Amino acid sequence: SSPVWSEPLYSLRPEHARERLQDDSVETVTSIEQAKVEEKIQEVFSSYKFNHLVPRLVLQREKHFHYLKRGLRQLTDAYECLDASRPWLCYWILHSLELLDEPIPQIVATDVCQFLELCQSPEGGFGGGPGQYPHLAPTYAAVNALCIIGTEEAYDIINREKLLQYLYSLKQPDGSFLMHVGGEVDVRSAYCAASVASLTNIITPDLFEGTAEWIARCQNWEGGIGGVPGMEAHGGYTFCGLAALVILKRERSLNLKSLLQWVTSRQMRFEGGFQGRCNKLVDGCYSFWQAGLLPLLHRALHAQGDPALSMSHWMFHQQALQEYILMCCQCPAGGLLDKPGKSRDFYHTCFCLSGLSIAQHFGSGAMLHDVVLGVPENALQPTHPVYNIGPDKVIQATTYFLQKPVPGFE
Amino acid sequence: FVSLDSPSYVLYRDRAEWADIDPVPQNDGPNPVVQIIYSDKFRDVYDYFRAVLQRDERSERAFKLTRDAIELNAANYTVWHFRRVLLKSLQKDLHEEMNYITAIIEEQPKNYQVWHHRRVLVEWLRDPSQELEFIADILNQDAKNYHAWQHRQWVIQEFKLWDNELQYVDQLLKEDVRNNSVWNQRYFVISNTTGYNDRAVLEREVQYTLEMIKLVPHNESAWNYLKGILQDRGLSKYPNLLNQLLDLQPSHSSPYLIAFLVDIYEDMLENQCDNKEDILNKALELCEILAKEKDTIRKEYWRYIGRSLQSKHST
């Protein structure tokens, strides 16, 4: 076959050029923008090929590590726009470090715990910063961050009694949840609530009454799920919807057939990465939101006894996604990105890596099959498809909280 | 009055009208993490915002302060919530506030808080008279803005403004037939007005979609809409469609057409079609063509479909 120092790539096959956009000689804003991206991506792909010599791809772990380590402590005023999302920054950075198997010093861990405690609201839940009103987004992020740390100190920071009361204060009669008091409603809330409620063992029989039905109403004609009933299928909202239903054990409420066909169609034939909506551009962060749906669908179909399911691969092109992330989404200075030409940020660093991990690891029952493209060191730690934190962290957290009673309920 | 970038702007800690209240610093703890090095102007505004919030001061000065806090960080939902509390407490002119949110959304159209604020104002005023035109302006700048389309669907459904939306949809499809957000709006409008059970309506839609496909064969949105309006009843329930697609195949063997044929065959086999063995063989052949040549990015999906078909209809 091939010497160990050369690894043929899918994106470099001669026939891959046939995957370039065919605009049928009818130009519109959509095709013009798509063509521009493909042109740049082809240039990038070609830079990794030297005729028959194709060096193994390398995840610049050290560069990413230093970028993350610095951000966990300090940020420039360029992040003032995220002053109401500091728990998000904690989660994005800690999860990235977790995926890279970079240890978190005990001191830093304790400091994160203390900071998130300051973000916790007396009414329950966490806000975007100290003294801010609670909101399901930073609440979801804070809980995931504390679970990544996984110490009893981190676990005990969460005021479970008030958290459940807070979730109740956001629950609507139609099954949906507000993102915060007097705030907006969309499927993100159902997932944020289901995620933190299941991890901390505070689910009551009535908490999610009608929620599964509401989420199902969000699935549309495309097969994907929109933010609210009637809206366009979107990768981020679809992940939220399916992940929430998986937590509620109500995945069957959806048409899994149309959902599967929709998400698989979101992988770009040329770029290899995923788009968030039909006819929109590729974006590295959808490597997780979209690709993450495949392990969830695999699990759902497996629970139904689907005899046709693969026992070694997810139903998306795992290699092509890794090729897009490794060749197109890494910032040479550290950190990951949306696409070539975009600047790095912690959000994309978190999700590009999360998506890379999903693409590298397949697991079902007693079967495990890894596909790590490039040098062996590229292997990332696995991530749980529902919570997007390490599976070990999920088990440890769920086990810890299951030892506590549901707040004021039997 | 004065804006954050105005030459005469004065920090709140230097304003005589604010001297009577002490600012409240943000407590990040002794050993901060994800600490943002705020500009002097940013910290100044928020130190005073924290002060009025802590004292729950429902005042005109507090109201003006929120405008600056919002300019510094429009994503701060706490500031927006407080501003709404003040709008009511101070009985502020909501039409004036509508002009304000209009300008803010124009500046930050992808922000969750600004769109929700606008919705609240429309709900308080029960006045949607400016909505369709405003949204249209936002969509003229970004025809796929998710927040804009979502707000548009809410306004139309809440105030029953369906009368001219199909015309709007047709206009945008003419501009960019690849705009998936518009095809979604098309389904939204039809399903909520005439519905698709009216066979005259369904035929009109199928004809229109097929015409769009012929014009731009590789536009996935049209193909997805065609499947979308026929899937619930079952693709095998439309025998003439299969024939028409089979005729275009030789000249338009795109992965979209081939995949659609497989979808038809799948449904046919599910409804005890005649010549079952022949249909299964044709479906498996296409799955192989898709997996190996025409749609290789989805090789795993097509292989799965092939195995699924065999698990359900081998006999």
């Binding site: 109401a84 999302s85 998000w88 909101h135 987004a137 930073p138 993102m179 993100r188 981020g236 974006d283 962060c285 990105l337 949306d338 030409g341 975009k342 600047s343 940020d345 959000y347 994309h348 | 994503a75 992808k110 922000n111 969750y112």
Partner: peptide
């Protein structure tokens, strides 16, 4: 390079 406009909340 330009910053990505992706926001989660």
């Amino acid at each position: 390079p330009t910053a990505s406009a992706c926001v989660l909340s």
